[PDB]
Enzyme design. Structure first.
Site, PDB file in Angstrom:
ATOM      1  N   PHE A  42       0.557  -1.341   0.059  1.00 48.26           N
ATOM      2  CA  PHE A  42      -0.056   0.005   0.157  1.00 48.26           C
ATOM      3  C   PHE A  42       0.902   1.427  -0.102  1.00 48.26           C
ATOM      4  CE2 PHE A  42      -3.964  -1.815  -0.689  1.00 48.26           C
ATOM      5  CZ  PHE A  42      -4.722  -2.314   0.412  1.00 48.26           C
ATOM      6  N   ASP A 157      -2.065 -13.153   5.347  1.00 51.14           N
ATOM      7  CA  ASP A 157      -0.795 -12.692   5.175  1.00 51.14           C
ATOM      8  C   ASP A 157       0.232 -13.013   6.603  1.00 51.14           C
ATOM      9  OD1 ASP A 157       1.151 -11.401   3.747  1.00 51.14           O
ATOM     10  OD2 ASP A 157       0.560  -9.396   3.983  1.00 51.14           O
ATOM     11  N   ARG A 161       7.175 -10.611   9.777  1.00 54.48           N
ATOM     12  CA  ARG A 161       7.172  -9.277   9.505  1.00 54.48           C
ATOM     13  C   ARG A 161       5.781  -8.275   9.503  1.00 54.48           C
ATOM     14  NH1 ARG A 161       6.806 -12.505   4.358  1.00 54.48           N
ATOM     15  NH2 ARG A 161       4.590 -12.008   3.326  1.00 54.48           N
ATOM     16  N   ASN A 162       4.655  -9.178   9.582  1.00 53.78           N
ATOM     17  CA  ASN A 162       3.504  -8.534  10.097  1.00 53.78           C
ATOM     18  C   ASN A 162       3.165  -8.384  11.348  1.00 53.78           C
ATOM     19  OD1 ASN A 162       3.159  -7.493   7.128  1.00 53.78           O
ATOM     20  ND2 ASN A 162       2.589  -9.683   6.568  1.00 53.78           N
ATOM     21  N   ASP A 175      -0.045  -6.059  10.808  1.00 53.92           N
ATOM     22  CA  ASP A 175      -0.714  -5.920   9.507  1.00 53.92           C
ATOM     23  C   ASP A 175      -1.799  -6.672   9.089  1.00 53.92           C
ATOM     24  OD1 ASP A 175       0.550  -3.633   7.218  1.00 53.92           O
ATOM     25  OD2 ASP A 175      -0.609  -5.543   6.133  1.00 53.92           O
TER      26      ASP A 175
HETATM   27  C1  LIG Z   1       4.393  -4.842   8.296  1.00 57.84           C
HETATM   28  N1  LIG Z   1       4.984  -3.650   7.835  1.00 57.84           N
HETATM   29  C2  LIG Z   1       6.133  -3.188   8.351  1.00 57.84           C
HETATM   30  C3  LIG Z   1       7.276  -3.393   7.716  1.00 57.84           C
HETATM   31  C4  LIG Z   1       8.152  -4.662   8.520  1.00 57.84           C
HETATM   32  O1  LIG Z   1       9.260  -4.873   7.692  1.00 57.84           O
HETATM   33  C5  LIG Z   1       9.968  -3.715   7.580  1.00 57.84           C
HETATM   34  C6  LIG Z   1       9.369  -2.869   6.670  1.00 57.84           C
HETATM   35  O2  LIG Z   1       8.299  -2.491   7.511  1.00 57.84           O
HETATM   36  S1  LIG Z   1       3.773  -2.546   7.010  1.00 57.84           S
HETATM   37  O3  LIG Z   1       4.640  -1.312   6.707  1.00 57.84           O
HETATM   38  O4  LIG Z   1       3.165  -3.146   5.831  1.00 57.84           O
HETATM   39  N2  LIG Z   1       2.555  -2.592   7.993  1.00 57.84           N
HETATM   40  C7  LIG Z   1       2.732  -1.886   9.404  1.00 57.84           C
HETATM   41  C8  LIG Z   1       1.516  -2.093  10.345  1.00 57.84           C
HETATM   42  C9  LIG Z   1       1.506  -1.421  11.495  1.00 57.84           C
HETATM   43  C10 LIG Z   1       2.528  -0.714  12.167  1.00 57.84           C
HETATM   44  C11 LIG Z   1       2.400  -0.057  13.211  1.00 57.84           C
HETATM   45  C12 LIG Z   1       3.101   0.239  14.110  1.00 57.84           C
HETATM   46  C13 LIG Z   1       4.610   0.589  13.887  1.00 57.84           C
HETATM   47  N3  LIG Z   1       5.219   0.774  15.224  1.00 57.84           N
HETATM   48  C14 LIG Z   1       6.490   1.045  15.198  1.00 57.84           C
HETATM   49  C15 LIG Z   1       7.197   0.798  14.035  1.00 57.84           C
HETATM   50  C16 LIG Z   1       8.890   0.845  14.431  1.00 57.84           C
HETATM   51  C17 LIG Z   1       9.726   0.748  13.320  1.00 57.84           C
HETATM   52  N4  LIG Z   1      10.901   1.085  14.034  1.00 57.84           N
HETATM   53  N5  LIG Z   1      10.735   1.196  15.077  1.00 57.84           N
HETATM   54  C18 LIG Z   1      11.925   1.380  16.267  1.00 57.84           C
HETATM   55  C19 LIG Z   1      12.533   2.576  15.925  1.00 57.84           C
HETATM   56  C20 LIG Z   1      13.824   2.498  16.649  1.00 57.84           C
HETATM   57  N6  LIG Z   1      14.808   1.419  16.296  1.00 57.84           N
HETATM   58  C21 LIG Z   1      13.829   0.085  16.880  1.00 57.84           C
HETATM   59  C22 LIG Z   1      12.621  -0.123  16.005  1.00 57.84           C
HETATM   60  C23 LIG Z   1       9.444   1.038  15.536  1.00 57.84           C
HETATM   61  C24 LIG Z   1       6.703   0.538  12.945  1.00 57.84           C
HETATM   62  C25 LIG Z   1       5.221   0.399  12.738  1.00 57.84           C
HETATM   63  C26 LIG Z   1       4.899   0.052  11.477  1.00 57.84           C
HETATM   64  O5  LIG Z   1       5.592   0.593  10.391  1.00 57.84           O
HETATM   65  C27 LIG Z   1       3.596  -0.823  10.987  1.00 57.84           C
HETATM   66  C28 LIG Z   1       3.505  -1.418   9.885  1.00 57.84           C
END
Ligand SMILES: CN(C[C@@H]1COCCO1)S(=O)(=O)Nc1ccc2ccc3ncc(-c4cnn(C5CCNCC5)c4)cc3c(=O)c2c1
Length: 301
Positions: A42, A157, A161-162, A175
């Site tokens: 998305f 899904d 990762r989700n 997700d």
């Molecule tokens: C599954 N996917 C994530 C993917 C996973 O693989 C990698 C790419 O993204 S996706 O983007 O499709 N859906 C979603 C769905 C819900 C969320 C909800 C909350 C969330 N809360 C914290 C962090 C965060 C991200 N980093 N941090 C911390 C920051 C400091 N360092 C430790 C991690 C918190 C990231 C997220 C999100 O991006 C997130 C993403």
């Protein structure tokens, strides 16, 4: 593209009515658009700031659409936000709200998950989860999945990762991009990019998804946990997976995974869907393995 105008009249009235009672006023949200925290099909996820009923700054995650070309993309994106509105379980991520201003993409506001995604967390050599910690994460995912199945929603899904981890190390299915309401039919067939390596044999063949096909994906998620985030079937190509599985070949036992946990994984990948354990049975079986595994641990599951 930031100047996109969504014609609400082109969308289903039930959906607009649904989005209306979860709507966040544009004045209550600050999107840190220069701070990307996640990426998917998305679009991007941003660091956000939500101002509560009083005025306390709530740290959040903001999902946005990348390139809005058609109304279907908007309809799908808003449907995932809607599916999440009534979720109330510690192992399932809740919806904070939907920001739908005059211009630009709708924004799906979610609670911020401190430690980010489960796959990266387990791959991080500073976190170093123990065999018992990994089992505990598995148990948490199973519980969330038991709740989602009882609400008659098929994930479609399920992968590490989700899933995300909050400040207390609580694992949540985060997700819901491919999630669908099963209503009463006990399934979901594709009509309108699927993750092949986590899909049940029958789903790759018939394009039909059920709670039992989610059970298969849970098995793969369990395998990712025990291998500490290694890709499944790395020497098998996406297109060959269906034959590879019809021949009875499955993901092999990870190097530090207990024998009864691998036995659970194999049951999740049974060719006959009816034979697979339910999420209820998985919670009980994984709980028994977890409680009887005496090794070092840290977190609470
Ligand atoms: C599954 N996917 C994530 C993917 C996973 O693989 C990698 C790419 O993204 S996706 O983007 O499709 N859906 C979603 C769905 C819900 C969320 C909800 C909350 C969330 N809360 C914290 C962090 C965060 C991200 N980093 N941090 C911390 C920051 C400091 N360092 C430790 C991690 C918190 C990231 C997220 C999100 O991006 C997130 C993403």
């Amino acid at each position: 593209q930031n100047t996109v105008h969504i014609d609400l009249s082109a969308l289903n009235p039930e959906l607009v009515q649904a989005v209306q009672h979860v709507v966040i006023g544009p004045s209550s949200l600050i999107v840190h658009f220069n701070e990307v925290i996640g990426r998917g099909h998305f679009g991007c996820v941003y660091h956000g700031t939500l101002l509560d009923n009083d005025g306390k700054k709530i740290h959040c995650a903001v999902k946005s659409l990348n390139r809005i070309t058609d109304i279907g993309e908007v309809s799908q994106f808003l449907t995932e936000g809607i599916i999440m509105k009534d979720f109330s379980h510690p192992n399932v991520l809740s919806l904070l709200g939907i920001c739908l201003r005059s211009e630009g993409s709708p924004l799906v506001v979610l609670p911020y998950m401190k430690h980010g995604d489960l796959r990266n967390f387990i791959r991080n050599e500073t976190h170093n989860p123990t065999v018992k910690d990994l089992i505990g994460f598995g148990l948490q995912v199973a519980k969330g999945m038991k709740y989602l199945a009882s609400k008659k929603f098929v994930h479609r899904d399920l992968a590490a990762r989700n899933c995300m981890l909050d400040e207390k190390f609580t694992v949540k299915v985060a997700d819901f991009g491919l999630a669908r309401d099963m209503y009463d039919k006990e399934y979901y067939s594709v009509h309108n990019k699927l993750p092949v390596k986590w899909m049940a044999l029958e789903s790759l063949q018939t394009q039909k998804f059920t709670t039992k096909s989610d059970v298969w994906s849970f098995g793969v998620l369990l395998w990712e946990l025990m291998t500490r985030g290694a890709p499944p079937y790395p020497d098998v190509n996406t297109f060959d997976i269906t034959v590879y599985l019809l021949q009875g070949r499955r993901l092999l036992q990870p190097e530090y995974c207990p024998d009864p946990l691998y036995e659970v994984m194999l049951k999740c990948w049974h060719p006959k869907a009816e034979m697979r354990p339910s999420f209820s049975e998985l919670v009980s079986r994984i709980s028994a393995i977890f409680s009887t595994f005496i090794g070092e641990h840290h977190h609470h599951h």
